[PDB]
Each structure stands twice: as C-alpha cells, then as structure tokens.
Design a protein around this ligand. Structure first.
Ligand SMILES: [Cl-]
Ligand SMILES: [Cl-]
Ligand SMILES: [Cl-]
Ligand SMILES: [Mg+2]
Ligand SMILES: [Mg+2]
Ligand SMILES: [Mg+2]
Ligand SMILES: [Mg+2]
Ligand SMILES: [Mg+2]
Ligand SMILES: [Mg+2]
Ligand SMILES: [Mg+2]
Ligand SMILES: [Mg+2]
Ligand SMILES: [Mg+2]
Ligand SMILES: [Mg+2]
Ligand SMILES: [Mg+2]
Ligand SMILES: [Mg+2]
Ligand SMILES: [Mg+2]
Ligand SMILES: [Mg+2]
Ligand SMILES: [Mg+2]
Ligand SMILES: [Mg+2]
Ligand SMILES: [Mg+2]
Ligand SMILES: [Mg+2]
Ligand SMILES: [Mg+2]
Ligand SMILES: [Zn+2]
Lengths: 71, 103, 97, 77, 50
RNA sequence: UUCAAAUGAGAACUUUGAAGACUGAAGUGGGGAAAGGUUCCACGUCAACAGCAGUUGGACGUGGGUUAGUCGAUCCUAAGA
RNA sequence: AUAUGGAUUCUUCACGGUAACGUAACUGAAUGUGGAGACGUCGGCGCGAGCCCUGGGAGGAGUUAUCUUUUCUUCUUAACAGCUUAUCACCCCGGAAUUGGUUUAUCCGGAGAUGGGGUCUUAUGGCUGGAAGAGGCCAGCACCUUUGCUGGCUCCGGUGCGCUUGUGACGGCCCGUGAAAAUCCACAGGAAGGAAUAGUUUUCAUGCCAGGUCGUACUGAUAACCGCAGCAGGUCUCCAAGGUGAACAGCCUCUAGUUGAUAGAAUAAUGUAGAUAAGGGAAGUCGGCAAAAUAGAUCCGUAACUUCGGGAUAAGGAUUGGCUCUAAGGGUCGCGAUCAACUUAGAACUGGUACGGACAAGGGGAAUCUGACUGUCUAAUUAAAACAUAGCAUUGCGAUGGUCAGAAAGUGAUGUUGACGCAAU
C-alpha cells in the first residue's frame, strides 16, 4: 500500500462495510480537505473493506500521508 | 500453433459465447467475443426483407437517426413498395365499385 | 540495377591474422550464378583495395548469400572464434575481431 | 479516431474553447517509387474525439506551425 | 465457487480468523487448564459443510 | 534414469548446470463450470504428516494478496413454484 | 441537465429521383397495426477469417573433412471511426418458338425471360484515422549502483477437394414442422402546438455532469472436488502444429509441461505379463476354451435363396518397392504467349523374388432350433429365446360422458382434447 502512495498518488483506507463509494468520497474530502478523482473498493478475505482513493493532480498523496502521520 | 481461451467465465459454446481469433499489435493471437448477427426487418404483408432499412439489434435502433429506419413514402419502414402499390390500387377500385353498387 | 555489397575488413587486417587478398579470391571461385561456379560472365565483379571488399552483382545475389560464403571461408582457416560477420547498415557489413 | 482533410476546419478546432493540447508527429515515409519525404501529422485533442490532419508537403507544414495559436499547448514528437 | 454469494464469503472470513494456535500468555494465567486449541480446523482434514 | 557443483550435522529424493527420455495438440499443454476455501505468494522453519528418505512441500509458525458505468449477478420469462 | 452552430418557416412543420430510393437535420398526443427479440437437423456448393505450406529481400543463430545461394528463427496491427465494397432482392426501358437463360444438384419466364442501364441490406473485405510514439528483431556505448543512452530494419508476393470456424444462397426429411417474455423501432391516425422582427427542432454536430451494491486469489484433479486417504475409481466444457496415412487411427517430432510412483544386489523353483517351436494337425476338451490363420488398396471373378431391396468384402484368384521416363486431365490474357495444381494410366531399368516390408488390419463355407429387424433390463454372479416394437384384433365412451385421482372442497389428470379421439387389454 505504501508503494501506491509514493508512485500512483493513491491513498489506501480501511472503511466501514456499510459505506458505498459516494460516502467514502464525501468523507475523504471533509476529513482531509482534498479532491478525489475516483474510488475503487473491495472486500478483503478477513471481512473488512478496503478503498483505493486516487487524488487529483492538484494534490500529492505523499505529503497528505505524512500530514496524517503514517508513512 | 498458438492456442486461445475464452475471456469470460462462460466455458460452453452457446449462441451468446461465440468467438473470433484475431492478431493484436503485440504479435499474439487472442480470442475476440462477437455478438449475434442482426436480422433485416421484414414486410408486414408479404414477409420479405425491407429495402433501405439498416440491419441492427433491436436496442441499437434507438441510437441511429430516423433516416436509417424509414423510406420516404407511405408505410416507409413497414411495408415494401409492391405491397403499398397493391393497397392503393385495391383501395381505389373497391371504393369506385361501392359507388356504382349504391346506385 | 546492379547492387553494391561492401565488407569492411580493416579490424582483422590490422592484427595480421587475416589476408584480404585471399578472401577476395575465395569469393571469385565460389559465388554460384545461375547454377554452378565459374559463370561470372560480366555479372558479378569483386574488387579489392586492402581495407574493404566490394562486390557488385546484377544476377541473383543477396546479403544472406554473402554471409553464408564468408562463414565457410572463415571456418576453413579456423577463425570462427575471433571473427564475426556483422551488418552495420543495409548492404554494408564488417568483420569484428 | 477521426481524420480531417480540410485545412479551414482544422484551424477552428484549435480555438473551440474545449481544446487544451495538441501534438505534432513527423514521419519519414517513401513515395510510390522514389526518394522518401517528411510527413507531418497534426493531432488536436478534443473533449470526445481526436482529430488528425495529415499533410505530405513540408513547405505547407512550416506555415501551419507559425499560424498555430500560442495559447494551445503543442507537443513536439 | 469463484462466483460466490456474500453469505458464503462472510463465513469463510470468520473461519480464516479462527485458524490460529493458542496464544502463549493464556497458559501463564492463574488456575489455567487450557493446553491447546481443541477446535483447530484444516482444509485437508475436516470440511466446513457450509 | 545418470554425472558434477552448490547448500547442509546429514543428500538415490532440495537447487543449478550437463546428458538421456516421455506426454506428442481428443496432451502429462493453456483456460473455465460444479465443488473446495486460502490450498495462491513471501519469509522463517522440520517434533508430527508426505506407508523409504528429506535441507523440500498442498506440512508447521508469521504475514501479504482479489481494485469494474462496459465481465457476471442484479432485469425477463421457460417447465414449474 | 442545457447553450452554440447548423437545418426549417413570411407557401408555416425540408428537398431531390420516371422509379427502386437518396440525405447531417427535415413537428406528431390518445388509439391501432406491423417488425425485431425469435429459434430443428442433415447434405453438397460459394465466400471470409485464423492456421498450415511456399518465393524474393533485410537481420540473428546453427552446420561446414566434404556437400549444402543451405537448416532454424524475427518481419506484428485491437476496439472504435470516415469513405468504399455483395450474393440475394427490387426498379426503368424493352417484348421472347428457330423457346431461351441457368446450378455440382433443373428450376425460372407474357403474372414479362434473355439483354442494356440503375437501386438496396454491409455478414465480409480494401484504403485511411487509431498508429508506430506501441510491440518485435539487431548493432554500437557507458556500468558495484537508483541503471539506462544512441542508432538502424520492421518490406513485397504466391498457392488450395488442405485444417478449424463463421456465414450465404439452396436441397433432403417428418402422422416429429422444431420456446416464451422483458425490451427497442417503424408505420397508420391527426389531438395539440407553433413564424415576421420572430419560433420550433436535444432522432444533425459540438460542449457539461453522474453511473451504486455483491462476486473477482488459486486448484479443477494418478495430490487442492467425491469415494474413511496424497485411493490405477468417478466427475460438464472451449482452444488443437509438422511427417507418414483415407483419417481427431497407430507410430516419430516442434511449442509448452513433466522426468514424479522406496531403493541396492543377485537371476532358484512356482507364478503374472509378453513370445517362439521339428513331424503330426483337435487325436485335447462338456465344448476349438485359449491361441493361430485372414487383414489395406487396385484388378478379375462371385452360388443357393429372396419380401427383388439383398445375400456380397459371398466363395475363389492376381498385383503392390526403388529409379529413369511417357501420355492424358487446367487458369489468365491478346491461335499464340504466360502461370499454377496431385490425380490416373502405361513403359524400360534395377534386387539374395524383396515391396499394405514397422505400424495398421474381415477366417470362410453347408445346415438345424429360436426371436422378424434397430432398440431395452436384473448398478455388484443371469444380455437371453426375456421386455419393447411396427402390424393385427377385441373392449368402453357423444361431455349431465368413459378411465383415473382426492380426507374434503365453489378440488383435480386425460383436456390448449372430441371417435382418423381418448381410455382399457
Ligand atoms: Cl474462492
Ligand atoms: Cl518362471
Ligand atoms: Cl417371422
Ligand atoms: Mg468490485
Ligand atoms: Mg446468458
Ligand atoms: Mg507412447
Ligand atoms: Mg514420443
Ligand atoms: Mg505454494
Ligand atoms: Mg516417511
Ligand atoms: Mg523421517
Ligand atoms: Mg499452518
Ligand atoms: Mg483469476
Ligand atoms: Mg476430499
Ligand atoms: Mg509345431
Ligand atoms: Mg474328441
Ligand atoms: Mg478323450
Ligand atoms: Mg476364441
Ligand atoms: Mg432380437
Ligand atoms: Mg445402425
Ligand atoms: Mg448382474
Ligand atoms: Mg453379465
Ligand atoms: Mg416377446
Ligand atoms: Zn411486402
């Protein structure tokens, strides 16, 4: 997941099983003050949902990731 | 000598699972799924194929222009010219005969 | 419609293990034209100047044939381990030591 | 995807208010039997389709580059 | 089985998380009698009958 | 089936190279449906299991991995319920 | 969601063509009608695609005592878009016996052939855009390294009872004539709505926004499924190279994949599996059980009997290699030129008389009992003469009915049926 942050400008999140793509996009914009290009989601084999959130070109996923605190 | 596989999860050779082998810009043979061929619209009186009407699947007629789906004449995309000709001749002759039967 | 074929033999010649005169003579007696050898009736001409080998032909000839004859001559003198027939541009070849 | 042949309709595409980029492609191609020539292809990236103008005259290709709008972004090769 | 319903996959997820040995610090508790995981399941021995 | 090297406390069985063979395109090849459910992949590791062996493994321990407006489900009706 | 451009209107809701019909567009409510969705199987023929085969040329590799202008390998083009491309069908002119046209297959013409000129469906193919910037094949340079950089070429053809597959026009067959619905379009109809200082068209072009939810790894089997298991069992389907040959047969090979099944030494008896035998030839045995013999192709020849269709590959004979030649069988162009297929027949020569040289591959005849035939059954001891079958005959019934079902019912099967039917033997 860290490679996508550095290379693909994509942030990877674990999200609620009840949330759809509309809610994930809205939550990311409000929590982090960024813009979202598209969202891809999947259900992991352990029963949790993972979302691939790609930001627009005006934003960098690397500087947002360390602003949150993880690296 | 290069062999191909289905690109969907249907493994059976049904009508909706027909394929055609093509060669890609990458230099390899790959299967291509083709849809079922369309059928020409037929005349409503004699059942013959209509001239000047595009041959498409039913839902594809909603994307093409009206000129593709009609002929500039009465009963354009419904009946052929010969059947329309018989309708006009029959309509005129019978109505004339009705007048002389009245008198 | 005569096509020109040129072979650069400077690299093996400067070492002293290759004889350009012998190579040119070998091509004269082995290029088959319209059948057997010896029918070079003003159709295939091979020249020599000590640094390059130029073959001018109007009859049936190709670069693949030229490489085929060179390899036969190369092994006849036991020189396949050091000399390789390499094409730089179209219809322009060289021997690499 | 769509090839344009008229020079007049090419110039209006470059200022259609929805075009941002264009590219110039130079191909060295041979004629029917003789020496090669320089082929220049002008591609305009529209919102829904890509328009390509192909001209085989080197002299006319130079004039079109000069008349190309400066606002439009041009990619060379 | 590649095309599976959500009910089947959800039960598959639960079985995946239960397929672990006994935590070690459990054996050190006061008055502990649990020695190993008695409900361990392996795909080669007993089927889930799901 | 054979030779050599590497690894290891330990090699007829692990790895690499060389050689000899076979499946011979209705295959011992390349994909799927039903079914199984993590067996997929990496690292660590050999008490038990692989009816010889084992440094190897579909084993053991710990983790990683399944991204769709266009592929399916979803919609339609069939025998029927 | 909506603007612009274009089109249309002061003859309000467009024009052209004799016509088939054509186009960038070129109002259409209720209601009605039609089409598409939408269909069997077999046979030969036409065409397309991929593959196979092959020539020239530009690269790389292998062999080289000798021979081999040689052996192997790379030379590719997606969805989509514009123009164009067709058997069939149709339109106009014209009016046919001295009947013509015409398919491998004999059907068509005064209900208008042949012929001349046109229109149309776009399966399909060609060119161009996509697109060489990709991918593929090589050469020359740096270099522990994050690792690249610069160069060239990627071209033009041929062939077909070939293979796989798609499709078209036809033909054979039935007491069998071989789904439904959602959904989409067209037409008929004319309710309304619209122009002159102005409106309508989102079925013409361009531009704007959004498209949720669940599945998606891997095996698919001599180890991932089911058989107590890592069991020689069982379990649906797609893709399919070269040679030999009629062949998806057997045998050998390329691509790809495996090289796994406890091993070492020795070679007694008895076994299991595979084989050969002098002379005799079923004397063996309940019984020719088992094994042997026959075997492809070409030619010659072929009985009793018969429902005339068969029997029949009846029976019984001859031939088959290699090599060098001969003859016949075509296409395309202006009697010549030129190009390209394996089919058949025949003749010399040659040999340890061998030649369907491995592989592959019918024993046959004279009669009796019995069932007509193809078909079906005792999964795990019986495949038959048993069952079924067409044919034949008998029986019941005209619906307030016959046969049968149900605890009951304002309940059911035959019956989406009607004696050329249904039901019972
Ligand atoms: Cl799964
Ligand atoms: Cl024995
Ligand atoms: Cl009888
Ligand atoms: Mg998904
Ligand atoms: Mg389906
Ligand atoms: Mg074998
Ligand atoms: Mg073999
Ligand atoms: Mg594994
Ligand atoms: Mg063991
Ligand atoms: Mg052991
Ligand atoms: Mg484990
Ligand atoms: Mg997969
Ligand atoms: Mg099992
Ligand atoms: Mg004997
Ligand atoms: Mg006896
Ligand atoms: Mg006796
Ligand atoms: Mg026997
Ligand atoms: Mg019988
Ligand atoms: Mg039969
Ligand atoms: Mg039995
Ligand atoms: Mg039996
Ligand atoms: Mg009987
Ligand atoms: Zn009609």
């Amino acid at each position: 997941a860290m490679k996508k942050v550095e290379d693909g400008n994509i942030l990877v999140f674990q999200v609620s099983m009840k949330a759809n793509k509309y809610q994930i996009k809205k939550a990311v914009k409000e929590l982090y003050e960024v813009d979202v290009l598209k969202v891809n989601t999947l259900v992991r084999p352990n029963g949790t949902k993972k979302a691939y959130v790609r930001l627009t070109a005006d934003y960098d996923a690397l500087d947002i990731a360390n602003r949150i605190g993880y690296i | 000598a290069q062999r191909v596989t289905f690109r969907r999860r249907n493994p059976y050779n049904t009508r909706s699972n027909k394929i055609k082998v093509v060669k890609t810009p990458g230099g390899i043979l790959r299967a291509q799924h083709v849809k079922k061929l369309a059928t020409r619209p037929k005349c409503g009186d004699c059942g013959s194929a209509l001239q000047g009407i595009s041959t498409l699947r039913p839902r594809q007629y909603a994307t093409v222009s009206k000129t593709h789906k009609t002929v500039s004449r009465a009963y354009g995309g419904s009946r052929c010219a010969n059947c329309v000709k018989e309708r006009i001749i029959r309509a005129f002759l019978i109505e004339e005969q009705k007048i002389v039967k009245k008198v | 419609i005569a096509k020109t074929f040129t072979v650069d033999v400077s690299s093996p010649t400067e070492n002293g293990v290759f004889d350009p005169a012998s190579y040119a003579k070998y091509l004269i007696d082995h290029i088959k034209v319209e059948g057997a050898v010896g029918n070079l009736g003003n159709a295939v001409t091979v020249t020599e100047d000590g640094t390059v080998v130029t073959v001018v032909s109007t009859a049936k000839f190709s670069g693949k044939y030229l490489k085929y004859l060179t390899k036969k001559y190369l092994k006849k003198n036991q020189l396949r381990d050091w000399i390789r027939f390499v094409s730089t541009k179209t219809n322009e070849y060289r021997l690499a030591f | 995807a769509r090839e344009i042949t008229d020079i007049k309709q090419f110039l209006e595409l470059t200022r259609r208010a929805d075009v941002k980029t264009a590219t110039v492609k130079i191909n060295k191609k041979l004629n029917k039997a003789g020496k090669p020539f320089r082929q220049t292809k002008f591609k305009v990236r529209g919102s829904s389709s890509l328009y390509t103008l192909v001209i085989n005259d080197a002299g006319k290709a130079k004039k079109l580059i000069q008349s190309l709008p400066p606002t439009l972004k041009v990619n060379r090769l | 089985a590649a095309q599976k319903s959500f009910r089947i996959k959800q039960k598959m997820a639960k079985a995946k998380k239960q397929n672990r040995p006994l935590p070690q610090w459990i054996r050190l508790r006061t008055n502990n009698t649990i020695r190993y995981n008695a409900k361990r399941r392996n795909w080669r021995r007993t089927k889930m009958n799901i």
